[PDB]
Amino acid sequence: FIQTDKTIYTPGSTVLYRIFTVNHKLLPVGRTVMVNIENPEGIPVKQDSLSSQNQLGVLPLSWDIPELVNMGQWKIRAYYENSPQQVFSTEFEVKEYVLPSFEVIVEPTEKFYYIYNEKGLEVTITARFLYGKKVEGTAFVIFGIQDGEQRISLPESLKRIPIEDGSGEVVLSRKVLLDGVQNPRAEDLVGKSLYVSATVILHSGSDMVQAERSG
Amino acid sequence: ISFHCYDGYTLRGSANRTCQVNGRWSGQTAICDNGAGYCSNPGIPIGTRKVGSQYRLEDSVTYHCSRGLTLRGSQRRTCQEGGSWSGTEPSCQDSFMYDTPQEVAEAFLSSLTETIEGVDAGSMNIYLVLDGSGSIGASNFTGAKKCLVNLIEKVASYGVKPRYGLVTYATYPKIWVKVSEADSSNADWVTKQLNEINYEDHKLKSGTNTKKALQAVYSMMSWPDDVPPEGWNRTRHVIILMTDGLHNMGGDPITVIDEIRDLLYIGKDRKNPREDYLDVYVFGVGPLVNQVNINALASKKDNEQHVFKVKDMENLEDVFYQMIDESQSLSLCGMVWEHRKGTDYH
Amino acid sequence: EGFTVTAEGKGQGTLSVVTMYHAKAKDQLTCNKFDLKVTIKPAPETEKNTMILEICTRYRGDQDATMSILDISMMTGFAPDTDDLKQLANGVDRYISKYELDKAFSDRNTLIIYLDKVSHSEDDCLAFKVHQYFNVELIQPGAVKVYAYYNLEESCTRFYHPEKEDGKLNKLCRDELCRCAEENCFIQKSDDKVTLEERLDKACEPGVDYVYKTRLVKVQLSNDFDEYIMAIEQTIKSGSDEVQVGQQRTFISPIKCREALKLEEKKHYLMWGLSSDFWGEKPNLSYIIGKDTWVEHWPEEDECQDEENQKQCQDLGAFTESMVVFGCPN
Amino acid sequence: GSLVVKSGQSEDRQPVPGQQMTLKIEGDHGARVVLVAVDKGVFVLNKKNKLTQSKIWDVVEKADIGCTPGSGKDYAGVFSDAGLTFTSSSGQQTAQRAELQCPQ
Amino acid sequence: DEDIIAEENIVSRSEFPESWLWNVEDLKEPPKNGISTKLMNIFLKDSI
Numbered sequence A: 001f002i003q004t005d006k007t008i009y010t011p012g013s014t015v016l017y018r019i020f021t022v023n024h025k026l027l028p029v030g031r032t033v034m035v036n037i038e039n040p041e042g043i044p045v046k047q048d049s050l051s052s053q054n055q056l057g058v059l060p061l062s063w064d065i066p067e068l069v070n071m072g073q074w075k076i077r078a079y080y081e082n083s084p085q086q087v088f089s090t091e092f093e094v095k096e097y098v099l100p101s102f103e104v105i106v107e108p109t110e111k112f113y114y115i116y117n118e119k120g121l122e123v124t125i126t127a128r129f130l131y132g133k134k135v136e137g138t139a140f141v142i143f144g145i146q147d148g149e150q151r152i153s154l155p156e157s158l159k160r161i162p163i164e165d166g167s168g169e170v171v172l173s174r175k176v177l178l179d180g181v182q183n184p185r186a187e188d189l190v191g192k193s194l195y196v197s198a199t200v201i202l203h204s205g206s207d208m209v210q211a212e213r214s215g
Numbered sequence B: 001i002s003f004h005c006y007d008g009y010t011l012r013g014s015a016n017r018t019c020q021v022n023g024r025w026s027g028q029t030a031i032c033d034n035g036a037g038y039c040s041n042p043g044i045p046i047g048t049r050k051v052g053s054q055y056r057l058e059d060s061v062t063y064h065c066s067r068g069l070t071l072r073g074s075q076r077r078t079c080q081e082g083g084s085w086s087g088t089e090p091s092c093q094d095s096f097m098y099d100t101p102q103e104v105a106e107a108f109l110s111s112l113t114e115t116i117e118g119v120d121a122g123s124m125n126i127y128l129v130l131d132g133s134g135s136i137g138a139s140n141f142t143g144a145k146k147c148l149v150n151l152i153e154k155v156a157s158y159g160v161k162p163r164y165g166l167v168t169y170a171t172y173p174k175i176w177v178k179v180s181e182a183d184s185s186n187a188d189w190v191t192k193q194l195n196e197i198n199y200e201d202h203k204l205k206s207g208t209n210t211k212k213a214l215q216a217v218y219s220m221m222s223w224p225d226d227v228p229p230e231g232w233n234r235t236r237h238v239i240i241l242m243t244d245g246l247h248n249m250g251g252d253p254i255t256v257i258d259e260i261r262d263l264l265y266i267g268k269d270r271k272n273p274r275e276d277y278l279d280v281y282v283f284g285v286g287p288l289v290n291q292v293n294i295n296a297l298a299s300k301k302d303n304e305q306h307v308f309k310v311k312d313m314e315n316l317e318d319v320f321y322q323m324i325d326e327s328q329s330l331s332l333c334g335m336v337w338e339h340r341k342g343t344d345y346h
Numbered sequence C: 001e002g003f004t005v006t007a008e009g010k011g012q013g014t015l016s017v018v019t020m021y022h023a024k025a026k027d028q029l030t031c032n033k034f035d036l037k038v039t040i041k042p043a044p045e046t047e048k049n050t051m052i053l054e055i056c057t058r059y060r061g062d063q064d065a066t067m068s069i070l071d072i073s074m075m076t077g078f079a080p081d082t083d084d085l086k087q088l089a090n091g092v093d094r095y096i097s098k099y100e101l102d103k104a105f106s107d108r109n110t111l112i113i114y115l116d117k118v119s120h121s122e123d124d125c126l127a128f129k130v131h132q133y134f135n136v137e138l139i140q141p142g143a144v145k146v147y148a149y150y151n152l153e154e155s156c157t158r159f160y161h162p163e164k165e166d167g168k169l170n171k172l173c174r175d176e177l178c179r180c181a182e183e184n185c186f187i188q189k190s191d192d193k194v195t196l197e198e199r200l201d202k203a204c205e206p207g208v209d210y211v212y213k214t215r216l217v218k219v220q221l222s223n224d225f226d227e228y229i230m231a232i233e234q235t236i237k238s239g240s241d242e243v244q245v246g247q248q249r250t251f252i253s254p255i256k257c258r259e260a261l262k263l264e265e266k267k268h269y270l271m272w273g274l275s276s277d278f279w280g281e282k283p284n285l286s287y288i289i290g291k292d293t294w295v296e297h298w299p300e301e302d303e304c305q306d307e308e309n310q311k312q313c314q315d316l317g318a319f320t321e322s323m324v325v326f327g328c329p330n
Numbered sequence D: 001g002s003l004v005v006k007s008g009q010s011e012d013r014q015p016v017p018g019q020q021m022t023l024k025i026e027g028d029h030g031a032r033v034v035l036v037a038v039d040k041g042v043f044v045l046n047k048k049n050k051l052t053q054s055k056i057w058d059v060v061e062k063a064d065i066g067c068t069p070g071s072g073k074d075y076a077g078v079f080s081d082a083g084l085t086f087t088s089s090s091g092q093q094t095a096q097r098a099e100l101q102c103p104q
Numbered sequence E: 001d002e003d004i005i006a007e008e009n010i011v012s013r014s015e016f017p018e019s020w021l022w023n024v025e026d027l028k029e030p031p032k033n034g035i036s037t038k039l040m041n042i043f044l045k046d047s048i
């Protein structure tokens, strides 16, 4: 099992990672482990060969990120020396970013959508700060359909609601949804999923956060 | 305050450091390093800010002190071939930190003996510049004359007899002993010249023209179309000067220092830096001291100090009698000087 | 550097040499999806200053833009008129939130006007008045920022200021490197005189590098920096530049400091400055008239016969001989 | 075993930046505990790849040598679908297994 | 002005990391009810 400290990193920082070595009874043991670090293209950059002997099954390691580096989804692969066919992996992302000051939870009222519900799909937008306080501002919410991996957006469902006391409500109507597929039959939408994206902007205009609930 | 690194890191330097009476922290600088660079982590001295997280080869880091603090040392350091950073480790000084009399002569001799035991074979020049500006005083010159007498006997106590150069300046430079004399290597003859000097003419021309003094030091070491000399790539040069840093005539004296390093083939190559062939030591005499100007003139060699700031003059005379009581364990081991007869076993 | 690769042994391999660097092309990445023109104009006289801010925007593309966000920041000491924001918020395809309407004249230095659309064929312009509720001697320029909801990185930001052209700050730039020029133009107005007791002590400070007496030959206005060509008559204090009698040197002042100098051709002047005010490479050299440069007018030979300048011309003549013959004490 | 981390300080109020706090680490004896403290503004961008206890038991449950959740077609099919071998002196055995994974 | 804390007297918050407290602890305390409790004194960062 591979533990990382964060799930996303900037160029120039350092990645700290621990490796927990146990056997088939989930008790710690000392073996020889080969460690790999792969780029988004799948090519290993740094290889090591450590031993968890006399370490209580915890292997602390590190890796520096260069300033000029490829963004994307990196990978860390590890395997026992006696069983090279069984590889264990964990990913992490590399992106240029800054930290936001608030989160946006996009949760619909139900965890699904019924076809013949004339009320439509009601989605609750929750926005609070990291320290627990509530958020004043304005949101931008748009729905969309997804068939496999080919996504089809729905520009008819754009609403602009104000966010008062960290809360907001938005409804996608059934007539807007049936007009987007150009489908006279409503039974062909069984199987497809819906995705909602929200973008809340503060009253000071200093920060904004995009959030998405799909599937 | 105490230091402790994360998992998978090795702590080098003093783990437990203490703030002393001189406004400085005790011990060595604590460094958390992972051992992934060609060079080691240069670390963060207390009061500084390091810009540069990559510690690979040919990389660089820049340092900045806090508000109202003066940087001593190298502002920019570069990782060289072999695993050694260029310049020296910085240290943020203030307008009142100064230096204790023990710490001055302790670091000055550990630099000086390195460029003496490589001369061991007559092949070393020492230049002596003294400031006779009106901002120091007539009572503060004769106390500096008796200080310089103790310096010559300590150098001659190693069996090496170098060539000395005595120039006292103010508005104009006055050359008393030139290095191109037949008696300049006789260490007892130069001491006789040091009592015969008189500072009545420098008191009439009250001023601080540092640039015209260093142009006289350039004219002593330069050769008039002599065409490469025999000691051009084998002579160690040591420049010792006292000043207050408050120069107002002649201009920026740093432009003469860059002309000296170009003449000695220092920095004009990537495989042979030749930094051990020029050392520059600057001593601060009074409380009226610009610590920025004295730091830019002195050399910046690794793990070594060349800038000093003391007050009341008499304590600087106290560091010269203390250094002759201090015995340096001379080490002939591990010495390989570049002689042009490069057969093996040399 | 060109290097060699020696490969020995048995097997196959693949060598790859890539260099990453910063490429100088066109600088056109700002205003890539929008065009923004912001201008600040004073209001006409009815019967406490009021000015009119005009903002025009247009989307780059084949279609009209979707819902976008305008981030208007006010200049320090200016607030929008509360009647003009109620006009645009009730207007078609526009919305200002009720949290921003009833803030009154307390604190409304940032403002967000939500647009339902902005066209791509013609500019969608709005304008509103701003009152000066707090007169301050130095005014910071405000900013207008335009972006759609779905991509904040594709934005553009223009500034506005009634004196400086479109809110740009004064900086001195030659060959990519720029220095800050939002400081003073000379050191002080002075006029205290006091002769050497207030002039030798300033000139013999350790920061002062050069003291010259020059003559203006040609004034050349040229875009970013203003050129003042000064022929050197005599060297009073020889600085770090070896210059003889008759040679010329080029002097640089910014645009906002051209009015405070009032330099005229064929006149003589006295000037000193620091050694950090040097900005010239090779034997060519450019001097900087910054906030640590003293500028004083030197009247000519027949101009000192006035009884008003008789107190000043005896001050300037004795200043030269105390520096030529004796230099700086201490 | 068990591992709970809670505030060693008796609640108090919400602490101030720079303030010291006491952390209570409650676990098994002789256990090496490793720690990490993460800003919750990181999980806004990426809530994937968190190490939890439920994800650990998902890996153990998907490496079992038994496939069918109950019974078999005969008596020897019960053992091979539950992950066992039987052999006796009377001739009754189970089938061979040459695949490390389950069918399909 | 003359009232308020002087601006030079204010020491600014500077330590805003994204992750910290990456340490190893060994529960060597005496075990009561099969449970070992280690009290740690940690210093909180300047982030809000």
Ligand SMILES: *[C@@H]1O[C@H](CO)[C@@H](O[C@@H]2O[C@H](CO)[C@@H](O[C@@H]3O[C@H](CO)[C@@H](O)[C@H](O[C@H]4O[C@H](CO)[C@@H](O)[C@H](O)[C@@H]4O)[C@@H]3O)[C@H](O)[C@H]2NC(C)=O)[C@H](O)[C@H]1NC(C)=O
Pocket (backbone or CB within 6 Å): B228, B233, B338, B339, B340
């Ligand atoms: C003091 O300064 C002088 C002047 O710069 C300096 O003279 C140099 O001496 C070195 C030898 O010590 C010379 O190096 C060699 O010169 C010969 C010709 O004389 C060349 O053929 C050599 O090239 C081959 O040999 C190398 C190994 O010896 C190989 O690595 C190389 O690939 C070639 O096969 C070699 O360059 C040098 O040319 C002169 N330079 C000048 C300008 O005369 C003297 O050495 C200096 N003293 C000290 C102690 O450094």
Ligand SMILES: *[C@@H]1O[C@H](CO)[C@@H](O[C@@H]2O[C@H](CO)[C@@H](O[C@@H]3O[C@H](CO)[C@@H](O)[C@H](O)[C@@H]3O)[C@H](O)[C@H]2NC(C)=O)[C@H](O)[C@H]1NC(C)=O
Pocket (backbone or CB within 6 Å): B002, B015, B016
């Ligand atoms: C640097 O200085 C520190 C103190 O400033 C030294 O720490 C000392 O470490 C020993 C461990 O051998 C501590 O002993 C233990 O203390 C804990 C306290 O919780 C106690 O529970 C244990 O039973 C044990 O007695 C000692 O207390 C500690 N000193 C102080 C004053 O706390 C450290 O060793 C020094 N390191 C170096 C390299 O000099």
Ligand SMILES: [Mg+2]
Pocket (backbone or CB within 6 Å): B133, B134, B135, B136, B207, B208, B246, B247, C329, C330
């Ligand atoms: Mg002086």
